[PDB]
Write an enzyme that holds these catalytic residues in place. Structure first.
Site, PDB file in Angstrom:
ATOM      1  CB  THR A  35      -0.846  44.007  48.594  1.00 56.62           C
ATOM      2  OG1 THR A  35      -2.241  44.084  48.381  1.00 56.62           O
ATOM      3  CG2 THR A  35      -0.228  43.584  47.283  1.00 56.62           C
TER       4      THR A  35
ATOM      5  CG  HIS B 173      -3.363  44.831  42.520  1.00 58.38           C
ATOM      6  ND1 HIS B 173      -2.333  43.910  42.572  1.00 58.38           N
ATOM      7  CD2 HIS B 173      -3.756  45.016  43.796  1.00 58.38           C
ATOM      8  CE1 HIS B 173      -2.112  43.553  43.815  1.00 58.38           C
ATOM      9  NE2 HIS B 173      -2.971  44.224  44.577  1.00 58.38           N
TER      10      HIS B 173
HETATM   11  C1  LIG Z   1      -7.670  45.814  57.090  1.00 59.49           C
HETATM   12  O1  LIG Z   1      -7.469  45.494  55.731  1.00 59.49           O
HETATM   13  C2  LIG Z   1      -6.506  46.314  55.116  1.00 59.49           C
HETATM   14  C3  LIG Z   1      -6.665  46.188  53.620  1.00 59.49           C
HETATM   15  N1  LIG Z   1      -6.315  44.850  53.152  1.00 59.49           N
HETATM   16  C4  LIG Z   1      -6.134  44.541  51.858  1.00 59.49           C
HETATM   17  O2  LIG Z   1      -6.723  43.563  51.355  1.00 59.49           O
HETATM   18  C5  LIG Z   1      -5.223  45.339  51.019  1.00 59.49           C
HETATM   19  C6  LIG Z   1      -4.715  46.625  51.162  1.00 59.49           C
HETATM   20  C7  LIG Z   1      -5.211  47.341  50.111  1.00 59.49           C
HETATM   21  C8  LIG Z   1      -5.952  48.623  50.192  1.00 59.49           C
HETATM   22  C9  LIG Z   1      -7.106  48.724  50.982  1.00 59.49           C
HETATM   23  C10 LIG Z   1      -7.811  49.915  51.086  1.00 59.49           C
HETATM   24  C11 LIG Z   1      -7.365  51.039  50.428  1.00 59.49           C
HETATM   25  C12 LIG Z   1      -6.214  50.971  49.662  1.00 59.49           C
HETATM   26  C13 LIG Z   1      -5.504  49.783  49.555  1.00 59.49           C
HETATM   27  S1  LIG Z   1      -4.975  46.371  48.675  1.00 59.49           S
HETATM   28  C14 LIG Z   1      -4.799  45.003  49.741  1.00 59.49           C
HETATM   29  N2  LIG Z   1      -4.330  43.831  49.288  1.00 59.49           N
END
Ligand SMILES: COCCNC(=O)c1cc(-c2ccccc2)sc1N
Ligand code: NA
Lengths: 315, 317, 329
Positions: C65, C142
């Site tokens: 994000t 969100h």
């Molecule tokens: C390897 O990928 C990382 C995660 N990628 C994602 O899509 C990401 C990151 C978030 C998130 C993921 C897990 C726990 C808390 C927040 S919310 C978002 N847009």
């Protein structure tokens, strides 16, 4: 000057640079030529902004501050922008996710990615999945292409006959210290052996150079009819090691500590390189000796990295 | 005279507030005021473009880092950030001399924060480029002193007059032993016609060395008397006839309330380097005497000023 | 329709919750997002918001994000200070959020803020002199995920916007409906239009009642509610029946007391996509782990990668609409 260019630019546009073998003779010449142009521009404090409107992602999944800061400086000086991923390892970044998904998505946001990862595999997967060019900033096979190019750039400035290719125009170089794990030695050995070059491998038994690299050197020297049985010599001490060598390349780490003493019986023109960081291998007294150029070598990384980005991402 | 003083400051390292003399302070305070109005009028602020800085923070100090980065970006320049590392994770082995000799070939200048006094000094020795100290272990935090002094000068511009009849009085309150923000500013103030009320608890009294610098600098301009420095145990006496109340941090005894501000001068203004805990109550934020939030805001204008003065190769209006 | 008016309405707007975005604002966003899609796909200059300096505060690892928001800010031709690999406590240290946001907001034009704490983001808006975009918090607010989720749907089925009694969209949300707060936010936005819901879950992960009540309330408000508006299923076979959109949720090891509770009931394959509408498209906020098989990536019904890509375009739109000084280019 030497070769066409601007159709070499067309050849490099959107090219991924993972291994020094991805770079052919013409591309090396564009890079070395472009690197020299950025050197003078910066040394004249002239406008360097020849690649604006570009947004890059820098993924560093191992602490490698100096290479990252180098690549960020190059991107910023060309007048482009960069989002950084940093102070994480392979596992904190990917969490669950496959590399393929991570790069498929990340490459929809940015124009290109600079990627450092200990994993050899991960960079290869990343190229498979990325819709955008990747530059390897260092991996676990010891592919670190931009270090080879700035290593080679540094040499070319003091001995430009390496490029001339001719049984007359023969350069001799001593690699010293950990030759087993000095992956910087291997990558450069590979680039050098494409030209008229001779090699003195100075090591302590357990850290001898690998045979695989000897065979690539031998293969590439033969290709240009510059090979003999006096092309490669092994040494156990600096005394004999540092002899008729135009370049002394020290590796990171010992047995071989470079002093002003040990530099007394070298050629007058010999120059000393070291990818850095040094820890003890070269004594501070040598920094004053005009043969030492390891700090110009690190500086050259900026000019080479600017060259490579300009050649690949310019529209 | 800017095209003199700028030319004098070009490529200057600022490590300690004593690296800034009378005329440099005047250029800074003048340039800082220009950047205030430009920003407050939503005018173009891009007076320093095509510059690339490295910010090295080797201690968590978010407010100062974000400040310096905002200043660099608002002037229209760019910055690489080194961050969430300490002296040992960065320098993983490497000499500081090597690290700065190399890093300085990539960038036009470096903002450096490091707990180590030593490291910043070595860094200046080895760097081919200017360094601005963003905070170290000697308590040298020059840009804090400048924005502290900037804030004061806006409410009481006669500190700069060095007039025997226009003296400023200030009360420093709280941890005076360790509040090195007190020491740095005390040092800058005593160059002008100023009097000091040190309000502390016994073990947190101001150090002798600082009292001697104040005394030395007051004497230098013939503004010293035996009523130049007054010590207090309590706020009632402390806050007597003081134009400025500077509250310090603590790592309590002196809690500023609307009660304790009742018998202050009408013009008194309240500073605090921040962050506060319970030393100033939220009620005081409404009291028009409080300016600690404007003081933190001023750091942007001062940091922009200092970068423009040092790194500029149409002077701002 | 009238962007000159709606942009004027959105200038300096804080976006914390999808309920902060009304009918007209959604249309500006969807319209602007589509303009930035073509600009980028035509390699045209996208620098429609320069001379702007933002702070991005990420106080939990949410790298995708953050990188998205950074890309948007840089592509619009603006700049950003990043806070990263901090949590609420290492940042703030002692300090009150109110003091920290009062100060931070004097340096920058706007703040992108992600913090697990619901509370912190609310305090931040109250104390900030500058607009905040919530990039994700602990109440499951969100907003930008809702907008790009809805953007992606709107591109394949633009009659959601028509609110026409005879042009109803049907969607299946599948997987963890209890904790998939991405489902909750989007369910809320969808129920404002002529939409029907198949909640495909395991008993323990059924959709919460308070979400069902909001859907029911919002459907009734526009006379699109029936007893066939919301249907529950246990299985994909019934779940996937006549649905224009299949939204797969994540399943996050965390949210689950223990590793044993985690063990992956609804796995979308080419098999399970046999008895779907021909037009059905598959969304997934990502990252996936096992709920969609790699084989499905080839299947032209899958658009979850386009959906992630859309977040750049939506985030650019939203920044441009909110921060652009009295602009009309
Ligand atoms: C390897 O990928 C990382 C995660 N990628 C994602 O899509 C990401 C990151 C978030 C998130 C993921 C897990 C726990 C808390 C927040 S919310 C978002 N847009
Ligand atoms: Na940056």
């Amino acid at each position: 000057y030497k070769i066409d260019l601007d159709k070499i630019m067309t050849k490099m546009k959107n090219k991924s640079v993972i291994n020094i073998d991805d770079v052919d003779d013409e591309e090396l010449l564009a890079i070395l030529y472009t690197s020299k142009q950025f050197e003078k521009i910066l040394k004249n404090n002239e406008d360097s902004k020849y690649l604006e409107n570009k947004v890059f992602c820098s993924v560093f999944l191992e602490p490698s501050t100096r290479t990252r800061c180098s690549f960020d400086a190059a991107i910023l000086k060309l007048g482009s922008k960069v989002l950084n991923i940093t102070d994480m390892n392979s596992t904190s970044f990917y969490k669950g996710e496959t590399v393929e998904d991570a790069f498929k998505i990340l490459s929809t946001y940015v124009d290109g990615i600079i990627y450092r990862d200990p994993s050899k595999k991960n960079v290869d997967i990343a190229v498979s999945s990325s819709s955008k060019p990747i530059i390897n900033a260092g991996n676990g096979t010891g592919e670190h292409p931009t270090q080879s190019l700035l290593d080679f750039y540094t040499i070319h400035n003091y001995f430009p006959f390496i490029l001339d290719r001719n049984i007359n125009k023969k350069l001799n170089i001593a690699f010293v210290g950990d030759l087993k794990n000095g992956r910087t030695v291997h990558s450069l050995s590979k680039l050098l052996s494409r030209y008229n070059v001779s090699f003195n491998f100075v090591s302590c038994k357990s850290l001898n150079i690998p045979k695989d690299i000897v065979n690539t050197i031998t293969y590439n020297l033969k290709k240009n009819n510059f090979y003999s049985d006096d092309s490669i010599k092994y040494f156990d001490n600096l005394e004999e090691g540092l002899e008729d060598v135009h370049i002394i390349y020290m590796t990171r780490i010992n047995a071989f500590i470079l002093s002003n003493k040990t530099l007394e019986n070298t050629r007058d023109d010999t120059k000393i390189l070291h990818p850095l960081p040094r820890v003890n291998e070269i004594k501070v007294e040598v920094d004053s000796n005009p043969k030492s150029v390891y700090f110009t070598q690190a500086e050259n990384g900026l000019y080479v990295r600017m060259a490579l980005l300009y050649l690949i991402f310019s529209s």
